Swiss-Prot record, chain A:
Subcellular location as annotated: Cytoplasm; Nucleus, Nucleolus
Name assigned to this protein: Small ribosomal subunit protein eS6A
Self-association state and partner proteins as the record states: Component of the small ribosomal subunit (SSU). Mature yeast ribosomes consist of a small (40S) and a large (60S) subunit. The 40S small subunit contains 1 molecule of ribosomal RNA (18S rRNA) and 33 different proteins (encoded by 57 genes). The large 60S subunit contains 3 rRNA molecules (25S, 5.8S and 5S rRNA) and 46 different proteins (encoded by 81 genes). Interacts with snoRNA U3. uS11 interacts with MPP10. Component of the ribosomal small subunit (SSU) processome composed of at least 40 protein subunits and snoRNA U3.
Molecular function as annotated in GO: structural constituent of ribosome
Keyword set includes Ribosomal protein: yes
Lineage: Eukaryota, Fungi, Dikarya, Ascomycota, Saccharomycotina
Protein species of origin: Saccharomyces cerevisiae (strain ATCC 204508 / S288c)
Placement of covalent cross-link Glycyl lysine isopeptide (Lys-Gly) (interchain with G-Cter in ubiquitin): 116, 131, 149
Note: Present with 66000 molecules/cell in log phase SD medium.
Keywords: Cytoplasm, Isopeptide bond, Nucleus, Phosphoprotein, Ribonucleoprotein, Ribosomal protein, Ribosome biogenesis, rRNA processing, Ubl conjugation
UniProtKB/Swiss-Prot annotation, chain B:
CDD domains, per the entry: Ribosomal_uL14
Protein family: Belongs to the universal ribosomal protein uL14 family.
Post-translational modifications: Methylated by RKM1 at 2 different sites, but it is unclear which are the 2 methylated residues among Lys-39, Lys-105 and/or Lys-109.
MF terms in GO: large ribosomal subunit rRNA binding; structural constituent of ribosome
Species of the source: Saccharomyces cerevisiae (strain ATCC 204508 / S288c) (Baker's yeast)
PANTHER family recorded: 50S/60S RIBOSOMAL PROTEIN L14/L23, LARGE RIBOSOMAL SUBUNIT PROTEIN UL14
Protein name: Large ribosomal subunit protein uL14A
Residue list for modification N-acetylserine: 1
Location of the protein in the cell: Cytoplasm
Main location: cytoplasm
InterPro entries the UniProt entry points to: Ribosomal_uL14, Ribosomal_uL14_CS, Ribosomal_uL14_sf
Curated annotation (Swiss-Prot), chain C:
GO CC entries: cytosol; cytosolic large ribosomal subunit
Gene source species: Saccharomyces cerevisiae (strain ATCC 204508 / S288c)
Protein name: Large ribosomal subunit protein eL24A
Record flagged with keyword Ribosomal protein: yes
Any further remark recorded for this protein: Present with 247000 molecules/cell in log phase SD medium. There are 2 genes for eL24 in yeast.
UniProt record similarity statement: Belongs to the eukaryotic ribosomal protein eL24 family.
Residues of the full protein shown: 1 to 98 of 155
Upper classification of the organism: Eukaryota, Fungi, Dikarya, Ascomycota, Saccharomycotina
Gene Ontology MF: a single term: structural constituent of ribosome
Chain positions with Phosphoserine modification: 7
Amino acid sequence: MKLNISYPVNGSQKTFEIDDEHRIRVFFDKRIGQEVDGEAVGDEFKGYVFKISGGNDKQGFPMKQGVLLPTRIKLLLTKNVSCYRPRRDGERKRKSVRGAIVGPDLAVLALVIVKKGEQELEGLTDTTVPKRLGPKRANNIRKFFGLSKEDDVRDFVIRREVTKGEKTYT
Amino acid sequence: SGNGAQGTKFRISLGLPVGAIMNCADNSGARNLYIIAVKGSGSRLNRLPAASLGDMVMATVKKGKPELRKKVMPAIVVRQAKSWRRRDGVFLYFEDNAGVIANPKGEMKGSAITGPVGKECADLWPRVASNSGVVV
Amino acid sequence: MKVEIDSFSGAKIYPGRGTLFVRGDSKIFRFQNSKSASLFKQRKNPRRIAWTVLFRKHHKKGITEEVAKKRSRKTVKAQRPITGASLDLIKERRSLKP
RNA sequence: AACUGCGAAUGGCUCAUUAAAUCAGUUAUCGUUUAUUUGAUAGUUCCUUUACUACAUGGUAUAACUGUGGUAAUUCUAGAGCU
RNA sequence: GUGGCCUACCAUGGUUUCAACGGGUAACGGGGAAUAAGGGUUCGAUUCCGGAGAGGGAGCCUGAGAAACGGCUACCACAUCCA
RNA sequence: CUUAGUGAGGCCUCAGGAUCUGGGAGAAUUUGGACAAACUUGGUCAUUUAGA
RNA sequence: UGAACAGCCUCUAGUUGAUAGAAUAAUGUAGAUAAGGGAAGUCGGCAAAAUAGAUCCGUAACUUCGGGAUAAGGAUUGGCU
RNA sequence: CAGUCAAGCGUUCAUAGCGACAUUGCUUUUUGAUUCUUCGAUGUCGGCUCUUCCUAUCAUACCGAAGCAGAAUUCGGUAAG
RNA sequence: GAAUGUUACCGCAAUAGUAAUUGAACUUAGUACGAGAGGAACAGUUCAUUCGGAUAAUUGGUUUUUGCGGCUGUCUGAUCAGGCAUUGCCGCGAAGCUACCAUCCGCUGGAUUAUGGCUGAACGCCUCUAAGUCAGAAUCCAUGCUAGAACGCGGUGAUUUC
RNA sequence: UGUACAACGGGGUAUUGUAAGCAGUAGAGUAGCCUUGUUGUUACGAUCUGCUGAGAUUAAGCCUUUGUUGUCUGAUUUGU
Ligand SMILES: [Mg+2]
Ligand SMILES: [Mg+2]
Ligand SMILES: [Mg+2]
Ligand SMILES: [Mg+2]
Ligand SMILES: [Mg+2]
Ligand SMILES: [Mg+2]
Ligand SMILES: [Mg+2]
Ligand SMILES: [Mg+2]
Ligand SMILES: [Mg+2]
Ligand SMILES: [Mg+2]
Ligand SMILES: [Mg+2]
Ligand SMILES: [Mg+2]
Ligand SMILES: [Mg+2]
Ligand SMILES: [Mg+2]
Ligand SMILES: [Mg+2]
Ligand SMILES: [Mg+2]
Ligand SMILES: [Mg+2]
Ligand SMILES: [Mg+2]
Ligand SMILES: [Mg+2]
Ligand SMILES: [Mg+2]
Ligand SMILES: [Mg+2]
Ligand SMILES: [Mg+2]
Ligand SMILES: [Mg+2]
Ligand SMILES: [Mg+2]
Ligand SMILES: [Mg+2]
Ligand SMILES: [Mg+2]
Ligand SMILES: [Mg+2]
Ligand SMILES: [Mg+2]
Ligand SMILES: [Mg+2]
Ligand SMILES: [Mg+2]
Ligand SMILES: [Mg+2]
Ligand SMILES: [Mg+2]
Ligand SMILES: [Mg+2]
Ligand SMILES: [Mg+2]
Ligand SMILES: [Mg+2]
Ligand SMILES: [Mg+2]
Ligand SMILES: [Mg+2]
Ligand SMILES: [Mg+2]
Ligand SMILES: [Mg+2]
Ligand SMILES: [Mg+2]
Ligand SMILES: [Mg+2]
Ligand SMILES: [Mg+2]
Ligand SMILES: [Mg+2]
Ligand SMILES: [Mg+2]
Ligand SMILES: [Mg+2]
Ligand SMILES: [Mg+2]
Ligand SMILES: [Mg+2]
Ligand SMILES: [Mg+2]
Ligand SMILES: [Mg+2]
Ligand SMILES: [Mg+2]
Ligand SMILES: [Mg+2]
Ligand SMILES: [Mg+2]
Ligand SMILES: [Mg+2]
Ligand SMILES: [Mg+2]
Ligand SMILES: [Mg+2]
Ligand SMILES: [Mg+2]
Ligand SMILES: [Mg+2]
Ligand SMILES: [Mg+2]
Ligand SMILES: [Mg+2]
Ligand SMILES: [Mg+2]
Ligand SMILES: [Mg+2]
Ligand SMILES: [Mg+2]
Ligand SMILES: [Mg+2]
Ligand SMILES: [Mg+2]
Ligand SMILES: [Mg+2]
Ligand SMILES: [Mg+2]
Ligand SMILES: [Mg+2]
Ligand SMILES: [Mg+2]
Ligand SMILES: [Mg+2]
Ligand SMILES: [Mg+2]
Ligand SMILES: [Mg+2]
Ligand SMILES: [Mg+2]
Ligand SMILES: [Mg+2]
Ligand SMILES: [Mg+2]
Ligand SMILES: [Mg+2]
Ligand SMILES: [Mg+2]
Ligand SMILES: [Mg+2]
Ligand SMILES: [Mg+2]
Ligand SMILES: [Mg+2]
Ligand SMILES: [Mg+2]
Ligand SMILES: [Mg+2]
Ligand SMILES: [Mg+2]
Ligand SMILES: [Mg+2]
Ligand SMILES: [Mg+2]
Ligand SMILES: [Mg+2]
Ligand SMILES: [Mg+2]
Ligand SMILES: [Mg+2]
Ligand SMILES: [Mg+2]
Ligand SMILES: [Mg+2]
Ligand SMILES: [Mg+2]
Ligand SMILES: [Mg+2]
Ligand SMILES: [Mg+2]
Ligand SMILES: [Mg+2]
Ligand SMILES: [Mg+2]
Ligand SMILES: [Mg+2]
Ligand SMILES: [Mg+2]
Ligand SMILES: [Mg+2]
Ligand SMILES: [Mg+2]
Ligand SMILES: [Mg+2]
Ligand SMILES: [Mg+2]
Ligand SMILES: [Mg+2]
Ligand SMILES: [Mg+2]
Ligand SMILES: [Mg+2]
Ligand SMILES: [Mg+2]
Ligand SMILES: [Mg+2]
Ligand SMILES: [Mg+2]
Ligand SMILES: [Mg+2]
Ligand SMILES: [Mg+2]
Ligand SMILES: [Mg+2]
Ligand SMILES: [Mg+2]
Ligand SMILES: [Mg+2]
Ligand SMILES: [Mg+2]
Ligand SMILES: [Mg+2]
Ligand SMILES: [Mg+2]
Ligand SMILES: [Mg+2]
């Protein structure tokens, strides 16, 4: 199967493709939120601890933390729920869902790094990617920066450059 | 089995002796199928020919639209209930004896199949793969 | 090769074992052995039959160490700033004051 | 784009049920619900009540977005990073 | 919100030849239409008003307002695409 | 139309507590209900109708 | 207990009389149970299986109006308070 | 049940497949005829069961022939495993 | 099972019994053949029927395990634990037995038949036949399998003293 | 006279499905004495819960054992 590992300290992400039953089978009967030590999965990952986060089986259905079951069940979903985006005011729909319990029926296991291993992973700990948008509300600027209701914001806002070609704007 | 059955069929427990009555499971008119022969059956002094999953039989209809009664016609057992066993160790059984009426080519007479269907039956008659909801 | 479990009692069903019941509504029931499977056909309610997983789970039996604390949490504190506005000039001016 | 609000209960179509039902003309709400439109309508909100309570204005969590994905297939959508 | 709307307890009431109740209706009701001595007979699915339905039932979310269907959910009957 | 049997599903309610915050939220899950489609089997009323 | 002189258990009274011992083959006699089907068995449902008390509801053709009728078909049943 | 002659049937062509009049046989699950055995007793239809044998082979093995293009059939040989 | 010294172990094999069957789907191939309609087969593969010999991991059956639990009537004062109701009744019930209701396995060489042929005279030609000879069948004999001659046999061990 | 054999006992495995006892603010509820209760108290109540997946059975054709106890020359016959 495929592992979709995220590096959320750096905001990096990359997939990895793992054949070999015993290598995978470390994730089996593990649930969403359970932490996995890493040498079992490889020797690059030696050390790295993975908390299990989501992911899709074949045919593509998603997982859903809190179902138990290593099967699929057809559920009623609502607003404010996973794998459902309602098309209409108070619209509920009855949709299939895959269980939080990993099996070899999965194509992709979504993993979030919690502790780094003894070794760097290239597209994850080598590369770091910036947060897209910065503080906009008043006090939030005062908390990303720590300023007291004195320092007056205005100039502590972020200013994103971009060029007209020969006019570079702010 | 026989005419128009693409596939083989690994042997499965015979649960339907001639004279058994299986529910009619298609939207044809029929309420039941009463088995009178089994295609491809064997010969042994005093044995009854007996159908299982995805055999083709010959039944008359006891209960149903008069235009379907008092006459012989092909049929295909789609549900067993006398538990058989597969090449993966599992002893599985449905809750009812039931089949759908068909032709010698093995094409149905209704446009659907109500209830489930065993896989071995469906792996065997394409038109049953069509009309099936939940297989096994 | 999957171990299944008993949809009445809850016990692992190793390969080639027990009986599988495809009901009329197409809902499947796997029984490890004929004990559950007849207790099943007798319309018995597993939350009332002591020895079952479901009965226990519901009666809070033996669990002890699952309701015991664990230890899984990290400590981050890294910076990226904002895309488009110099990630260099966002830690110098971010020298703060109080 | 998306969020938020409002609308989608109007319109249009059909005459299947329906025989004291509907419908009609006539009443009743001293028997109740009402978005809206219209006109009115608000000094009181803290607390053992001098070493005071952000009012020069208190909180985060998300869409869109970036980026990583899954499925033959739908106005399917998951993991991650923002606001 | 009134009310056997429903539940408890309680009585034994309610309708009827001045036609109850039941059956039929190739019956939605009204404005109206056709037929011109008058009295009538026949008709109105159908452009306006009311009502009921969204393949048959039920159930409900959202909401000021729906038991809504160019909303959901279940079943029944249809019926579509596929790897 | 409807007895009896079986009974989906939403709703109300006893529980539940993947997680996630400050006693509360909250998914799978589940108890008890009212509502109740629907299947099986019968009955009934209306309207049809084959037949030596 | 229960409708009862029924069956089942008991007091009184009376028995414990009916060659014995060791095994537990085939076949039997007697008592039983079988997945799925369900009279296909057979001269024939022979045999066996199914039903069964009571409270309640419900009950057809036809009839000499007395019946047919426990017609048929249903629900119900402990304990304890 | 099987032959011999071969007038004929088979478009033509007697004998691929058939075959008149005649004539030669065989068989003993037909039915007769006989009355040898049993009337101081050979239990007397059918089925159930189950064994074995015959071949005048329905199928299956390998063949020759065809009025066998192919597919189907047909006549025939070795054959009762 | 007496008797061929005793006893024991390992074997040989006379004679005898013998067993496997039939179908289909794929593929061949929409192929050869045919104007067309139609429409095969050999090699290969997957399954099946009828039969046979085993076997009990599983699944099912069976229940005096009178093993656990449950229920009625009663008798032991109650309690506990029990007796009786030709195994009281009910659910579950290991073990064993057992079922195409369950699972596994069912060998390959030769010789020939019919029939097609080789060489070839009789008969200067011709002829599968006269001499000789090739190919040949669910047949036959073997291989395999079951007995093992209680008057068929072999190899081998130990063979007694008051 | 010993990797002996047996009777038990222990451990495994398996069946059933929570023992007896005691406890309880579980329990429709019910009695009795007043000091008539700002839980009055003493008991009693099918059932429920806890100790308790407990208790009971488990070779009689299951497995296994450092434990415990015991057992180990009766009879008949056979020769080329
Ligand atoms: Mg017969
Ligand atoms: Mg079965
Ligand atoms: Mg279709
Ligand atoms: Mg489908
Ligand atoms: Mg069993
Ligand atoms: Mg059983
Ligand atoms: Mg909007
Ligand atoms: Mg409208
Ligand atoms: Mg929050
Ligand atoms: Mg009211
Ligand atoms: Mg009255
Ligand atoms: Mg009256
Ligand atoms: Mg009248
Ligand atoms: Mg109408
Ligand atoms: Mg009208
Ligand atoms: Mg009108
Ligand atoms: Mg009309
Ligand atoms: Mg009105
Ligand atoms: Mg329509
Ligand atoms: Mg609707
Ligand atoms: Mg429309
Ligand atoms: Mg509309
Ligand atoms: Mg309907
Ligand atoms: Mg696929
Ligand atoms: Mg329900
Ligand atoms: Mg309620
Ligand atoms: Mg549910
Ligand atoms: Mg008529
Ligand atoms: Mg008529
Ligand atoms: Mg008595
Ligand atoms: Mg005697
Ligand atoms: Mg006696
Ligand atoms: Mg005796
Ligand atoms: Mg016997
Ligand atoms: Mg049976
Ligand atoms: Mg049965
Ligand atoms: Mg029946
Ligand atoms: Mg019948
Ligand atoms: Mg007969
Ligand atoms: Mg017969
Ligand atoms: Mg018969
Ligand atoms: Mg008779
Ligand atoms: Mg008779
Ligand atoms: Mg009968
Ligand atoms: Mg008889
Ligand atoms: Mg009888
Ligand atoms: Mg019975
Ligand atoms: Mg009668
Ligand atoms: Mg009855
Ligand atoms: Mg009661
Ligand atoms: Mg002749
Ligand atoms: Mg002549
Ligand atoms: Mg000719
Ligand atoms: Mg000629
Ligand atoms: Mg001629
Ligand atoms: Mg001739
Ligand atoms: Mg003769
Ligand atoms: Mg003779
Ligand atoms: Mg004859
Ligand atoms: Mg004589
Ligand atoms: Mg005579
Ligand atoms: Mg005599
Ligand atoms: Mg005699
Ligand atoms: Mg005689
Ligand atoms: Mg005799
Ligand atoms: Mg006699
Ligand atoms: Mg010719
Ligand atoms: Mg031809
Ligand atoms: Mg043909
Ligand atoms: Mg030949
Ligand atoms: Mg033979
Ligand atoms: Mg012979
Ligand atoms: Mg055979
Ligand atoms: Mg083809
Ligand atoms: Mg064609
Ligand atoms: Mg031609
Ligand atoms: Mg074997
Ligand atoms: Mg056998
Ligand atoms: Mg067994
Ligand atoms: Mg039993
Ligand atoms: Mg007992
Ligand atoms: Mg008692
Ligand atoms: Mg006690
Ligand atoms: Mg006694
Ligand atoms: Mg007695
Ligand atoms: Mg008895
Ligand atoms: Mg019981
Ligand atoms: Mg036995
Ligand atoms: Mg088999
Ligand atoms: Mg066999
Ligand atoms: Mg084989
Ligand atoms: Mg062999
Ligand atoms: Mg060999
Ligand atoms: Mg030889
Ligand atoms: Mg030669
Ligand atoms: Mg030659
Ligand atoms: Mg010459
Ligand atoms: Mg020759
Ligand atoms: Mg020769
Ligand atoms: Mg010669
Ligand atoms: Mg052979
Ligand atoms: Mg052998
Ligand atoms: Mg001899
Ligand atoms: Mg002898
Ligand atoms: Mg010998
Ligand atoms: Mg010899
Ligand atoms: Mg010897
Ligand atoms: Mg010797
Ligand atoms: Mg001893
Ligand atoms: Mg317990
Ligand atoms: Mg206890
Ligand atoms: Mg104690
Ligand atoms: Mg024994
Ligand atoms: Mg010990
Ligand atoms: Mg001497």
